[PDB]
């Protein structure tokens, strides 16, 4: 009755969705073939004969990444029409995925989303997984969000994007795509949870003792966060959090909607045995800058709002004591105009351990989603990079040759400057 | 689905292409007779990129072999993987260009270009989604340079949007293999700068240096240099044919390596090159691959990247590795050599990772570098060109074949503009 | 496919063709009777029943030298109509071989060459063997070259001529014939590879330890040079060199087209056993002034272009190292306007040892064809001799009585003066 | 195929011709009966040069025997090789010229020249490709001298483009065999200078010196002198007749040793010329042949080459020998004797080589020298002529035969012009 539709765009989104749906199948006991030997109803639809079909759409502009899914261990899980692929990727070009290649596939994906939503008695909204610094992840995602804002304007749309890391980068045009997609989706998105690959690498090294992690581990952690959220949506708990709750609590202003995600009990099995991961300890670990999953220091900014979603053997009074302790701490600073800046949800379902994974089996967990002004710094850095290239018009011909115009570059940069000014104004003291 | 059409022009092009097709067949498990004898399913998953399936489950390379003499065609046909190519795809003349660009671009190649284009169109029609073209040739020669340039121009006119990569063996710095090398190289580059998206420059002297100093090969024949070039080509196109944690086709590399349209001349390199007697004294790990890749002496073009600044770099890894390690190594490389990367392009490195390493290896990586040091090579050629054009030496061979000296001046001016642009962006400051 | 026609004119040409075709038959395994107990295609034609007829014409104005062939070992090899003879030679008289006696046989030889060309699929060109100082070799060769240029204008025409020696000489009117034939053939020839009998005598004495060599050994060495070139044309090699490659890489200007041939591993078996004739060794021996087959010291001029044609077990890397070493040498000087003055060809077929010859079996060999301004000196000397006689009009009546005019002598001398001026200008520094 | 017509005039001419045909038949294996009894196939491969094949495969010399008395015809007919010549080719008168040039050129020779010319025309028509003519005669006599000159003039009128060689026996310096020798010699030379292409001046006294001091013959006979003359004749015609490394026919030698039309008087010589007393000591090598050939003692004319300069020289070697050695010896001879060769003809030597040596020898060579020292001879004769013409001694015979003293003055003037030309070219400088 609270159906939520997951849309995975590009290689990053598709590979994160692989882990997410493996985790959901494990949590609900669904075999990879789709057979369980009504909590799942929000994400799975029963096929009459006892088969469960995910309420997901895997869309990419190239066949390889989704063709791995179509022939992988979970080939029997996804509806074959829900795995949509193009013929040529966007080639790390926003214009290709938004103007030239995207326009040839947008109708198909919208039709599939309509078919999925028709079966939904009550549609909560969409969870869009993608990457900021990709062609289809950035351009096609913006086009899809634009179309959704018209087809389902009222429904809530939450994004799970891989914000480009401050230093680590796998492409040279990431700032262009990031600025363009941010400008496009700054008004068509409700909440945008951010995670950097660099921060997750640091966490994996420090906490999980994995010296050489790959994208599989990062995707497992991101899937754990997405679980926490959709599990507050799925299972039964003392305090329940819906998508609209995230939208209402984490977004003080329509444009300041970029929370950062965090997961406290990131710990290896060997190390977990020596720690009593109490609610207070995981709450404290959530606010430790070293545990942030976006490579930005919250101490440089102020916490606009926080949303703590606990799972497992969690007592509400323990949560209250931990949050009071956090409020007492002066290393953690909150904006003046938010005297009460803590949304809290509690769920009775503890996290499930994916076999072959790295995370330990725990009785308690917490996912924090924090809207903080520190993210502004990241934006500034990104903006600077954009300038450095747009001064020379580097790579600009690639975008202009695919339907874009330099006017769009200028408009996106102006909008991003306005966003920076908005963040600066929000961070000031009311006095 | 993303078919690539391979074209070989001249002796150098045809020989390198033969070795390239041997390498690709080994990668995809195609026997010299065309039958698939592989063991992994991934080999046939993207066989359509380079091969065309024929009746009886035989795979025919999607290659066009072009020359102006039949000797190279006969040598290729009579050899290992000779029957692999379609017989109808061997287009050749009878005279030869005589190491003359004018002959191969205006008189001898003009007659054969219509037939070659008919074959190319026929090969392109049977493509669900054409990705681009590949040309293997030599700039310093006759048939190769001029005929391949004419074909490049005509194909670009017919297929303006498709990608056009050329693996061109440009003249070596120290010793020349043809007296008229500067003329052919200048006239070829004057068109490559305008009718291609990626030009992987390769020098035979750099390959000799690699074979004698890195591989410790006492007697490196052309088979070994061609094997190196084939490894580079396969590494460049691997992400199109196999899955990985970070895919990158030809267009992705072109977008990430060409800040401006005219700056599309790259220096390639291969990471795991090691002597036979040292294969047990080295750790095959991402740090070692990166260190070998970014070394000056590993570059396949006889240019020193320390004499310029890297406009951009791409690294296509192959094998099961950790993205954390790859990203950390690239960050360390960029931080250590902060002076060898342009400051106005943050994160100069583009990374792609595949899952299937080359046969017989656990890890590999192809490095592509768009650096301003390439200007030196052009400068060198330009100098020689003037040295011969001032006295009009050997010029009557080109003018007598239907060229005007104004064309020579235009080509020289174009290459001078190219080196000027490369220097300008080397000196550009944020 | 790549068919080439050999035309042997005069006694020198016919007696060099004897050795050339003996060598070709040995190389291709063809018996002297034309039978073998498709590399043999650019020079032989298959007559259905396995007989291989040489693609050559033996033309002379007297019967003796060709009647030796018609009754010799290879009497059964050549097509009887290809061996063309007159009745009275030119008697060392250019006019007789060009105007009076040549005109009566020119049509026959042209008809035979037309038959040969028709029998060919793709005609690379002609190799004209002759002698500068002979009557028919000088006059009839010029007439034939004029007619061929009229008929096959585009086809390349290469000459293998015996340039008169500086001191050794067998005729008193050599300068007249040489100057006249050079004047007549200057505008109708592409390349003219030149050798001297005196230089080859010196080479045979010093290298092969033959104290009394005859024309047979000279012809064997010249045939080895021709075999190197035509082997680049015949067998399969790493680097292939066609006739047009010579024509293009060796002739900077239309009139400066007189290279000098040189064969590196000239050595007897007894001396060869004690030597490791590596690529570097033979390459260095090529540029030794004493090893030139034209009696000209290359140190008196500047190399304009060199064509190194390697054979047998040769590695491209070794060739590159040797050529780099040569370029390092300061005694070997090139012109300022030829920074790239090396055409390199490599063939996989090692030289074939003729049973009864003096050359030892070797694994490698290089034939070097260098255009050099040193030849200018030779020209000057030749011209000097011409003047010494033309001042007294000595022997001029013999030429005038055979349909020639003294105006022709004056015009030829002026043309050779212009050629000397051209060489002087070309040798000047570009500064 | 290069037929030569041999004409013998007078007693000296007929005897020299008889010995010449003995030598030639020995060379070609023809026995005195006209039948081939040789061994090598080369003897018949060019028999047509000198012989006519008759029915029954008998070879008839292409010789015309002319005399004005029947004694010499009878002697030649009755002797070895006397049944070799065609009976129709004996054309003789009854009276004889009486050692009188006028009788043999105007009265008797005039009467018989028509028949001689008819026979010559028949011989020339029978020929396939006529090469030239040969005349053996003596200038001292009247029949030989006058008749040979008349025949030479008439044949040249009929066949102006053919080669005409005369092996003429010039008067000796010391002792004269005829009182009127200067008159006949001068009147004959006045025609030879104009109607001949090559004249080989032979003196009997030089031949006596050769046969006494070189061959150590105690009692030399005209047989031996005729043998030497025949050896030189056969050497030249053998250059013509047999295969060799460097061929040379009559026209080649004429072109290479006649810088000007009137300078065509040569001195011949034979190379080996070794006595039996020393045949076992000296080594037969090209250096020895050359040294003997260029020795002034070996010349067959009584003119010292050291008193003039060699306008030109021809060396017709015979036998298997190294061309390198021949050329080295020629160059050494020219360098050592640089003062004896005109400086304005570089390379004054014309070399020909033949594979087949003379019978009984392994090596041989014929030397033909065009030198200015020959002027001496003419000068000698000239002075003698004046000595008698001033007093008009013996002149009434010539006048009565039907001549005029103005003819004598013209002949003397022409001889003076000849000596003037020879001296001028001796004194000419580059
Ligand atoms: N966490 C995570 N990041 C990923 C993954 N795959 C790619 N990325 C990151 O996403 C960015 C690259 O975007 P792609 O995922 O390559 O983008 P795309 O949307 O597939 O774009 P095109 O292929 O250009 O159409 C880089 O920052 C990668 O590090 C993944 O599985 N997990
Ligand atoms: N290397 C070489 N030189 C030769 C040979 N035969 C003759 N010569 C040289 O060629 C020149 C003479 O040319 P001929 O060969 O006599 O010329 P032709 O063209 O036959 O002329 P005619 O017979 O006079 O019509 C001299 O330099 C000879 O030494 C030979 O077999 N080899
Ligand atoms: N790497 C490589 N270079 C080659 C090969 N064959 C020829 N070349 C180079 O190509 C140039 C000669 O051009 P070629 O290929 O002969 O010319 P074309 O066929 O006339 O276009 C020289 O630089 C040779 O070194 C080969 O197999 N491999
Ligand atoms: N060499 C040589 N000279 C001869 C011979 N017979 C005569 N003579 C010379 O010729 C001259 C005599 O002239 P001849 O030939 O008898 O005169 P003709 O009968 O008047 O023509 C003298 O010089 C003789 O010495 C001979 O057999 N051999
Ligand atoms: Mg992608
Ligand atoms: Mg000849």
Domains located in chain A, CATH noted: 3-248 (3.40.50.1440), 260-374 (3.30.1330.20), 377-427 (1.10.287.600)
Q: Are B149 and C308 in contact (CB under 8 A)?
A: no
Q: Are A275 and A157 in contact (CB under 8 A)?
A: no
| C82 CA: distance to closest CA in chain B (Å) | 25
SS3 C207: coil
Residue D387 is encoded by which pair of tokens? Answer: 């000595």
**Pairwise CA distance, residues C1 & B203, whole Å:** 32
Helical H segments across A209-329, by residue range: 215-234, 243-250, 269-272, 279-287, 316-328
Residue keyed to tokens 């996290």? A351
D344·C392 Cβ contact <8 A: yes
Burial of B66 (0-12, 13-18, 19+ CB in 10 A): buried
**Pairwise CA distance, residues A150 & A283, whole Å:** 39
Q: Give the CA-trace dihedral at D19, D24, D25, D27, to 10 degrees.
A: 130
Helical H segments across D337-404, by residue range: 374-389, 395-401
Domain over D375-427 is classified CATH 1.10.287.600: yes
**Pairwise CA distance, residues A361 & A359, whole Å:** 7
Cβ neighbours around C172 below 10 Å, total: 27
**Pairwise CA distance, residues B312 & B422, whole Å:** 13
Distances A374 to A247, A297, A379, A427, C91 between C-alpha atoms, Å? 20, 6, 9, 9, 106
- Give, for A194, the enclosing helix (H) or strand (E): strand A191-195
**Pairwise CA distance, residues D192 & D146, whole Å:** 11
Closest CA to B378 of B76, B230, B111, B170: B170
Question: Helix crossing, B181-195 with B148-158: angle to 10°?
Answer: 10
Q: Are B178 and C340 in contact (CB under 8 A)?
A: yes
Cβ neighbours around C363 below 10 Å, total: 14
Kindly write down the DSSP assignment for every residue of D41-71, as one continuous string: THHHHTGGGTEEEETTTEEEE-EEEEESSHH
Kindly write down the DSSP assignment for every residue of B249-318, as one continuous string: -HHHHHHHH-SSTT--EEEEEES----GGGTTSS--SHHHHHHHHT-GGG-SSS--GGGS-EEEEEEEEE
Cβ neighbours around D217 below 10 Å, total: 15
Domain ranges of chain B: 3-257, 265-374, 375-427
- C108 to chain B, any CB pair closer than 8 A? The answer is no
Mutate to test the pocket of ligand 2, among C137, C142, C174 (most ligand atoms within 8 A of CB): C137
SS3 A239: strand
Q: Is A133 in the pocket of ligand 1 (CB under 6 A)?
A: yes
**Pairwise CA distance, residues D156 & D7, whole Å:** 14
- φ, ψ of residue A246 in degrees (nearest 5): -60, -50
Chain B, 60 to 119: residues with Cβ < 8 Å from chain C are 69-72, 74-75, 94-100, 103
Contacts of D374 (CB under 8 A, 6+ apart): D201, D265, D266, D267, D301, D303, D308, D422
Cα–ligand 4 centroid distance for A140 (angstroms): 124
Nearest CB to D346 within list C11, C388, C397: C388
- φ, ψ of residue D257 in degrees (nearest 5): -135, 20
Nearest residue CA, atom 24 of ligand 3?
Answer: B177
Cα dihedral sign for C157, C160, C164, C165? positive
Q: A-chain residues within 8 Å CB-CB of B3?
A: none
- B406 to chain A, any CB pair closer than 8 A? The answer is no
β-strand pairing of B310-319 with B363-371: antiparallel
Distance, C-alpha D402 to centroid of its chain: 30
Q: B-chain residues within 8 Å CB-CB of C238?
A: 221-222
Distance, C-alpha B86 to centroid of its chain: 23
B261·A397 Cβ contact <8 A: yes
Domain over B265-374 is classified CATH 3.30.1330.20: yes
- C11 to chain D, any CB pair closer than 8 A? The answer is yes
**Pairwise CA distance, residues B220 & C318, whole Å:** 9
C388·D430 Cβ contact <8 A: yes
Cβ neighbours around D275 below 10 Å, total: 14
Residue B332 is encoded by which pair of tokens? Answer: 């360390």
Q: Strands of D62-176 (E only): list them.
A: 63-67, 90-92, 129-138, 163-170
Closest CA to B99 of C249, D232, C341: C249
Q: Give the CA-trace dihedral at B293, B296, B299, B303, to 10 degrees.
A: 150
SS3 A29: coil
Q: Strands of B278-423 (E only): list them.
A: 310-319, 349-353, 363-371
Residue C93 is encoded by which pair of tokens? Answer: 């008289």
**Pairwise CA distance, residues B264 & B311, whole Å:** 10
Angle CA A299–A302–A304, to nearest 5: 140
Residue C393 is encoded by which pair of tokens? Answer: 């009009």
**Pairwise CA distance, residues C197 & C218, whole Å:** 7
Distances C276 to C265, C273, D71 between C-alpha atoms, Å? 11, 8, 79
Contacts of B404 (CB under 8 A, 6+ apart): none
Cβ neighbours around D426 below 10 Å, total: 16
- C240 to chain B, any CB pair closer than 8 A? The answer is yes
Burial of B58 (0-12, 13-18, 19+ CB in 10 A): middle
Cα–ligand 3 centroid distance for B381 (angstroms): 17
User: For residues B157-178, b (16+ Cβ closer than 10 Å) or e, as one string?
Assistant: eebeebbbbbbbbbbbeebbbb
Q: Are A399 and A176 in contact (CB under 8 A)?
A: yes
Contacts 24+ apart (CB under 8 A), D282-288: D284/D361, D284/D362, D284/D363, D285/D325, D285/D363, D286/D317, D286/D321, D286/D322, D286/D325, D286/D326, D286/D329, D286/D363, D287/D325, D287/D329
| C203 CA: distance to closest CA in chain D (Å) | 12
| A367 CA: distance to closest CA in chain B (Å) | 24
Domain over B3-257 is classified CATH 3.40.640.10: no
SS3 B215: coil
**Pairwise CA distance, residues C407 & C415, whole Å:** 12
The single-letter DSSP state of residue A333 is -
**Pairwise CA distance, residues C383 & C391, whole Å:** 12
Cβ neighbours around B359 below 10 Å, total: 9
Mutate to test the pocket of ligand 4, among D14, D103, D138, D210 (most ligand atoms within 8 A of CB): D138
Residue keyed to tokens 């392994």? D362
Residue B264 is encoded by which pair of tokens? Answer: 């599309």
Contacts of C92 (CB under 8 A, 6+ apart): C133, C134, C135, C171, C173, C174, C177, D252, D255, D256, D350
Closest CA to D145 of D90, D99, D108, D200: D99
Q: Which of C244, C323, C325, C426 to mutate to test the interface with B (most CBs of B within 10 A)?
A: C244
Instruction: Count contacts between A and B (CB, < 8 Å).
Output: 120
Distances D130 to C51, D48, D94, D133 between C-alpha atoms, Å? 39, 11, 32, 9
Please state the three-class secondary structure of C173-193 as a single string.
CHHHHHHHHHHHHCCCCCEEE
Closest CA to B307 of B369, B225, B367: B369
Q: Are D16 and C78 in contact (CB under 8 A)?
A: no
D15 is an annotated ligand-binding site residue: yes
**Annotated binding-site ranges of B:** 10-12, 15, 69, 99, 138, 142-144, 177, 204, 222, 226
Q: Are A370 and A260 in contact (CB under 8 A)?
A: yes
**Pairwise CA distance, residues A365 & A376, whole Å:** 28
SS3 C429: coil
**Pairwise CA distance, residues C62 & D1, whole Å:** 10
Residue B79, CA atoms < 13 Å, CB-side half-sphere: 15
Q: D-chain residues within 8 Å CB-CB of C204?
A: 324
Q: Are A197 and B351 in contact (CB under 8 A)?
A: no
Residues linked to residue C157 through DSSP beta bridges, in sequence order: C126
The single-letter DSSP state of residue C86 is -
Q: Are D259 and C395 in contact (CB under 8 A)?
A: yes
Contacts of B120 (CB under 8 A, 6+ apart): B5, B7, B64, B151, B155
Q: Are A369 and A260 in contact (CB under 8 A)?
A: yes
- D160 to chain C, any CB pair closer than 8 A? The answer is no
Q: Are B313 and B349 in contact (CB under 8 A)?
A: yes
Cβ neighbours around D359 below 10 Å, total: 11
A63·B1 Cβ contact <8 A: yes
Q: Which residue numbers come right before each break in chain C (C to N over 2.5 Å)?
A: 37
Ligand 2 atom nearest the C-alpha of C164 is 27
**Pairwise CA distance, residues B418 & C11, whole Å:** 58
Cα dihedral sign for B343, B347, B349, B350? negative
**Pairwise CA distance, residues C62 & A67, whole Å:** 83
Helical H segments across D78-107, by residue range: 101-102
**Pairwise CA distance, residues B114 & B101, whole Å:** 18
C65·D312 Cβ contact <8 A: no
Cβ neighbours around D177 below 10 Å, total: 14
A204·B245 Cβ contact <8 A: no
Q: Do domains B3-257 and B265-374 have the same CATH topology?
A: no
Cβ neighbours around A380 below 10 Å, total: 15
Residue keyed to tokens 């694994």? C363
- D237 to chain C, any CB pair closer than 8 A? The answer is no
Residue keyed to tokens 């005196």? C198
| Residues that place a CB less than 5 A from ion ligand 5 | A 11, 89
Distance, C-alpha D116 to centroid of its chain: 20
Q: Is C131 in the pocket of ligand 2 (CB under 6 A)?
A: yes
Roughly how many angstroms between the first and final C-alpha of chain B, as a whole number? 42
| D193 CA: distance to closest CA in chain C (Å) | 16
Q: Are A9 and A59 in contact (CB under 8 A)?
A: yes
Contacts of D290 (CB under 8 A, 6+ apart): D271, D315, D326, D329, D330, D333, D365
Distances B285 to B212, B332, B420, C36, D357 between C-alpha atoms, Å? 23, 15, 39, 59, 84
Cβ neighbours around C429 below 10 Å, total: 8
The single-letter DSSP state of residue D290 is H
Closest CA to D239 of C89, C161, C14: C89
**D286: nearest CA partner in chain C:** C212
Q: Are B344 and B430 in contact (CB under 8 A)?
A: yes
Burial of A204 (0-12, 13-18, 19+ CB in 10 A): buried
**Pairwise CA distance, residues B6 & B86, whole Å:** 13
Residue D231, CA atoms < 13 Å, CB-side half-sphere: 25
Cα dihedral sign for D313, D314, D319, D323? positive
D–B contact: 3+ Cβ pairs < 8 A: no
Contacts of A201 (CB under 8 A, 6+ apart): A168, A213, A218, B324, B327, B328
Q: Are D137 and D144 in contact (CB under 8 A)?
A: yes
Resolution (A): 2.7
Cβ neighbours around D26 below 10 Å, total: 17
Cα dihedral sign for C274, C277, C281, C285? positive
């Amino acid at each position: 009755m609270r159906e939520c539709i997951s849309i995975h765009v590009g290689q990053a989104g598709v590979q994160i969705g692989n882990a997410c749906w493996e985790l959901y199948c494990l949590e609900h006991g669904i075999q990879p073939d789709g057979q369980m030997p009504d909590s799942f109803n929000t994400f799975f639809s029963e096929t009459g004969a006892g088969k469960h079909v995910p309420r997901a759409v895997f869309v990419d502009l190239e066949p390889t990444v989704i063709d791995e899914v179509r022939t992988g261990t979970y080939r029997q899980l996804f509806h074959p029409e829900q795995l949509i692929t193009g013929k040529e990727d966007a080639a790390n070009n926003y214009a290709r995925g938004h103007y030239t290649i995207g326009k040839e596939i947008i109708d198909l994906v919208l039709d599939r989303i309509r078919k999925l939503a028709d079966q939904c008695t009550g549609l909560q909204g969409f969870l869009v997984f993608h990457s900021f610094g990709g062609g289809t992840g950035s351009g096609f995602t913006s086009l899809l969000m634009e179309r959704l804002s018209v087809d389902y304007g009222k429904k809530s749309k939450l994004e799970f994007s891989i914000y480009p890391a401050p230093q680590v980068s796998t492409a040279v045009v990431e700032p262009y795509n990031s600025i363009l997609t941010t400008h496009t989706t700054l008004e068509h998105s409700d909440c945008a949870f951010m995670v950097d690959n660099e921060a997750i690498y640091d966490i994996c090294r420090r906490n999980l003792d994995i010296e050489r992690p790959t994208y599989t581990n990062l995707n497992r952690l991101i899937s754990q966060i997405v679980s926490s959220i959709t599990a507050s949506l799925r299972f039964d708990g003392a305090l329940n959090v819906d998508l609209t709750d995230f939208q209402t609590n984490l977004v003080p202003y329509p444009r300041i909607h970029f929370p950062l995600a965090t997961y406290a009990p990131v710990i290896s099995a060997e190390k977990a045995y020596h720690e009593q991961l109490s609610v207070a300890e995981i709450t404290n670990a959530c606010f430790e800058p070293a545990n942030q999953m976006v490579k930005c220091d919250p101490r440089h900014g102020k916490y606009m709002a926080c949303c703590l979603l606990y799972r497992g053997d969690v007592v509400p009074k323990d949560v209250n004591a931990a949050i009071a302790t956090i409020k007492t701490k002066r290393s953690i600073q909150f904006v003046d105009w938010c005297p009460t800046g803590f949304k809290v949800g509690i769920n009775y379902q503890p996290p499930t351990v994916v076999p072959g994974g790295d995370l330990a089996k725990v009785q308690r967990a917490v996912c924090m989603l924090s809207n903080t002004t520190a993210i502004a710094e990241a934006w500034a850095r990104l903006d600077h990079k954009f300038d450095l290239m747009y001064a020379k018009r580097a790579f600009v011909h690639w975008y202009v040759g695919e339907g874009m115009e330099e006017g769009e570059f200028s408009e996106a940069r102006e909008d991003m400057a306005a966003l920076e000014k908005d963040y600066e104004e929000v961070g000031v003291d009311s006095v | 689905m993303r078919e690539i059409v391979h074209i070989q022009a001249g002796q150098c092009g045809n020989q390198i292409g033969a070795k390239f097709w041997e390498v690709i067949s080994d990668e995809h498990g195609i026997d010299p007779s065309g039958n698939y004898v592989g063991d992994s399913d991934l080999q046939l998953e993207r066989i359509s990129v380079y091969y065309n399936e024929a009746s009886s489950h035989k795979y025919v390379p999607r290659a066009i072999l072009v020359d102006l003499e039949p000797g190279t065609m006969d040598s290729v046909r009579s050899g290992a993987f000779g029957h692999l190519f379609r017989p109808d795809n061997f287009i050749f003349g009878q005279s030869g260009a005589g190491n003359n660009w004018a002959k191969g671009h205006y008189t001898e190649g003009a007659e054969l270009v219509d037939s070659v284009l008919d074959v190319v169109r026929k090969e392109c029609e049977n493509c669900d989604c054409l990705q681009g073209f590949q040309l293997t040739h030599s700039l310093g020669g006759g048939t190769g340079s001029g005929m391949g340039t004419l074909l490049i121009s005509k194909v670009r006119e017919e297929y303006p949007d498709r990608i056009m990569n050329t693996f061109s063996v440009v003249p070596s710095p120290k010793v020349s293999d043809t007296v008229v090398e500067p003329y052919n190289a200048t006239l070829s580059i004057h068109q490559l700068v305008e009718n291609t998206d990626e030009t992987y420059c390769i020098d035979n002297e750099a390959l000799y240096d690699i074979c004698f100093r890195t591989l410790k090969l006492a007697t490196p024949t052309y088979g070994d240099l061609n094997h190196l070039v084939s490894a580079t080509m396969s590494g460049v196109t691997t992400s199109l044919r196999f899955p990985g944690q970070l895919n990158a086709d030809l267009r992705k590399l072109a977008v990430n390596m060409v800040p401006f349209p005219r700056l599309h001349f790259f220096m390639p390199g291969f990471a795991p090159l090691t002597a036979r007697g040292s294969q047990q004294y080295r750790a095959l790990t991402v740090p070692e691959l990166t260190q070998q890749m970014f070394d000056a002496k590993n570059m396949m073009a006889a240019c020193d990247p320390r004499h310029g600044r890297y406009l951009t770099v791409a690294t296509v890894f192959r094998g099961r590795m950790s993205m954390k390690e790859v990203d950390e190594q690239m960050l360390a490389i960029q931080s250590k050599n902060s002076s060898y990367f342009v400051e106005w392009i943050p994160n100069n490195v583009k990374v792609a990772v595949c899952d299937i390493p080359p046969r017989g290896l656990k890890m590999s990586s192809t490095f592509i570098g768009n650096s301003t040091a390439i200007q030196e090579l052009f400068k060198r050629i330009s100098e020689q060109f003037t040295a011969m054009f001032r006295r009009k030496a050997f010029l009557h061979w080109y003018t007598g074949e239907g060229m005007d000296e104004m064309e020579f001046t235009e080509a020289e001016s174009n290459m001078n503009d190219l080196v000027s642009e490369y220097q300008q962006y080397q000196d550009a400051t944020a």
